[PDB]
Amino acid sequence: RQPPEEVDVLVVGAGFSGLYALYRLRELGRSVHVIETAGDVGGVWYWNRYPGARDDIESIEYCYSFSEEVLQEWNWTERYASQPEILRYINFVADKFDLRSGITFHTTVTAAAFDEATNTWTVDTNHGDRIRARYLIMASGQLSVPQLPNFPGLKDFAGNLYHTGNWPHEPVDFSGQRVGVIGTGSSGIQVSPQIAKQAAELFVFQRTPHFAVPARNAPLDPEFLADLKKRYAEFREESRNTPGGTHRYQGPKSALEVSDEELVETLERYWQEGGPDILAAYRDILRDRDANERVAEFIRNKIRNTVRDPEVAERLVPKGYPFGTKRLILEIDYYEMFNRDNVHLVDTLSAPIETITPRGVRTSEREYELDSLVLATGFDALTGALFKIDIRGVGNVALKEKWAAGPRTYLGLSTAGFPNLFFIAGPGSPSALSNMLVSIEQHVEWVTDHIAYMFKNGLTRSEAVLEKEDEWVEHVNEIADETLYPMTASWYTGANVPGKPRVFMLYVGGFHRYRQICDEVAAKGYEGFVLT
Template sequence: MDVSHDQDRPGPGGLWDVVVIGAGFSGLYLLHRARELGLRTRVYEAAPDVGGVWYWNRYPGARCDTESMYYSYSFSPELEQEWPLEERYPSQEKNLAYLRHVTDRFDLRRDIVFETRISGAVWDDEEHVWTVRTDTGDEVRTRYLVTAVGCLSTPSKPRFEGLEEFTGELLYTSEWPEDADLTGKRVGVIGTGSTGIQSIPEIARIAAHVTVFQRTPQYTLPANNHRLDPDFVKDLKTRYREIRERCRHSAAGTPYPVPTRSALEVPEEERIAAFEQAWERGGGRLLGTYTDILVDEAANETVAEFVRRKIREIVKDPRTAELLTPTTYPIGTKRIPLDSGYYETFNRENVSLVDLRRTPIERFTPRGIRTSETEVELDAVVFATGFDAITGSLLAIDPVGRDGLTLQEKWAKGPLTYLGIATAGFPNLFMITGPGSPSVLTNMPTAIEQHVDWVIDCLAHLEKNGIAVIEAGARAEERWTDHVGEVASRTLYPMAASWYVGANIDGKPRSFMPYAGGLGRFRKICDAVAAGGYPGFRLGDRETEVDIDFGAFTPDIPTGVPQP
């Protein structure tokens, strides 16, 4: 629809209707939908271009771990028909190109302020307005503030003694310089999460030598990335609308077939055959072969031991294979990376592994890294140390809500939200895929569209009814947070010291942050809240108790879409 360019400017008194923080998948879609509603909207982005996580993470081997057919917007049938699908798993470059294409196709760039970071926001309870500060010293006022900052966008940068003495290059995967060149260099890589697992094989191909510093061994599954068959793509695009609907109501935002049997009820030979088939197919489907892999320790162990055997088969040196083999947590309870030859990389003569549990890093030196056992001479060190996930970027803004309450104070013992969308004491503040939503346990674009659509429908309700303020109720927030924890407790997720619980950040309070009940169930709950007139929220002077039994909703998980 045509949008008046009057929306490009604030209203009377310099007041915007909506200010959005971030121009990745969430922020771009939020801007598009807010325009459709006729709201004056301004987006602020710290980077010089759109893309969010796909702008910053340019490290070698950076690739999405959701298949390209589903890792995209579904709001525009024309967009999904015109965008070419080339590889099974899209690269960083392809994802960034896609988001740039969306930005230009829907003329979004004119409402985005780039290279501007939000440094704070304060709620005015008398005027019902947020005053938002930028790092350039500007202030803008807005009726609604929406955070679209992403779940993995605040890098974790651990400190080491002597770091400033090192004379070589220091590179962070989350802020990878475009001119970085590791050809022929002695490279140390610290961190073996998803980022390290993707980058290490690529670095090893060009470096003189790579030393991998591993704290915790990871389960990782082969991606089996490949070019998509044009006939498959053509057929898929004829059924895109049906497939998208299946994604929306599935547990993980994808149309993968759903298991129907327990891993423990089938003969071992049949179970192993199913695992082998999933391994050869590639991707994360191995964890979805049976119903109970993420809820039953014995079932989980059948998959974990299968992967351990694969590691021992692939890695030729028995000692290195032992160091790479996870044994201390259930498979899938940390984010499961997809790799392209990760374990095989340790068969190269120019790759060595340092086990930080046995020989920890003591300090950096001018020439490299000293462990408790030896000094490793290096020309460059790559930090693949992950992110302050889910809450880090929100707390970095640290908005000040009602009665001077800061978000840092509010969440001192862990995040509290209602539906992962709002938090009590912070009126007219909406979070896209915040803590307490399915977010990182799902296909992110599908989860983002659900959240954005819900927020836009809520704003439409407020505008239509002349309601100036909406705020999550403290009781609703408490009930939802309890429900999130209760659902997680029925899974194996809490058994791992993962970034899902904040374990990778020193001093971060431990709680399982995503909602593990599935996107289909979450969507039903959110729809019920909206249909019921937003119980649990304070709308203007009216607040109602939550009369919804969150646990009564069952997920709607359709099956039957063939995969490439």
């Protein structure tokens, strides 16, 4: 399916972001087209097909709200939707609004350069397509370029090698195998108990332990769903008016004001309920080290109590960093897993990995022989997908160079020197710090509204004002630095790609507050942009 030679707006990516941009620009009466590397729609939910892949936000929150018909018709089945169900949802949306007619699959954007003479992007692909677009929307994701761990010998490994972010499209059979998983973030935590059910022996190679709390998944009562439907739009505006984009209770107390007994009774209640709302149990968990630590110890002790062998249990306890500052994980039978005969925790802080071998993995203490190795080693987050494209602005400035010390943006939406270019739910904005469907919807609507505004007013050039970008970047940093988030090496800071600048990339002030700023900006005719 050939892309058009010219279009008002070209969109890279057919995940949640790109698909809604396509939908909305069509409704705004703009020509629009999508380029996507994958063979079909879904983004993250197309690529991450590993067993156990699942929502970490409730199904009823992690969904599109732009269409009443979609909200009324779709029936979610569990508290936390599995990947295949999310993928059926996305397919349902794409079918309903005939989206694929606007998408070129199997195609990768390789370069894009702005032409000051015409105020347009020329965009090239790996199939040799050249498309000329007035506006360019990068809906290319946050967690979309898989990162391999940095160990030698990977290509010498004789067995089968997988990354969770590029999982095969037909079921992988691990029956009777000695299997290793490297990585114990959300992907490792989700996949490992699934593999443990097939493998003769599973070895989990943990570096820093992450905090995880129980999901307590359950079926969704159909009468609950039917009630919610009667007030769904209302329910969703409630979620938009929050820092996190969900119904999470914002606990008004300080974790330091309470007694040890009240702290325990309160956290015990969250622990039994399950899910991520414990993050907001007390207002200062992500702001005060001593407040954080009280919560952290409570979680650490629950972890100790889950695993019988206390030497194994202790190796699972997170240390060295504040609770909640690497993204919180929901676990289903992951801690319980290590009580099984056939599951072994390899502590690689104690015994670092030296090399992959043809037979398996060598640490400083011994060699582990394996038939398959699964990398749950994450992603080159936030900037990874952009940096794979040769994006050039005014004066032939490469985006990758301009951002070599960290992403530099105004509201996260655009960067000075690169006009008519917009980034969806990326650095400098709430992004993954909120329910991403709320982050995504707000960005798509703001961008596509801004674009409609340009056409309406016969303007053809939109650019962020350098001084406002610099002030935004400093603001992002200053507000991050009032939290505990910069204290820790996470993907939010880039600290998991060797050599990437260690800088907290996201806006921490909350979705609601961010959206307010955005609306004030557009209300004043896009203050901090120069439009011509």
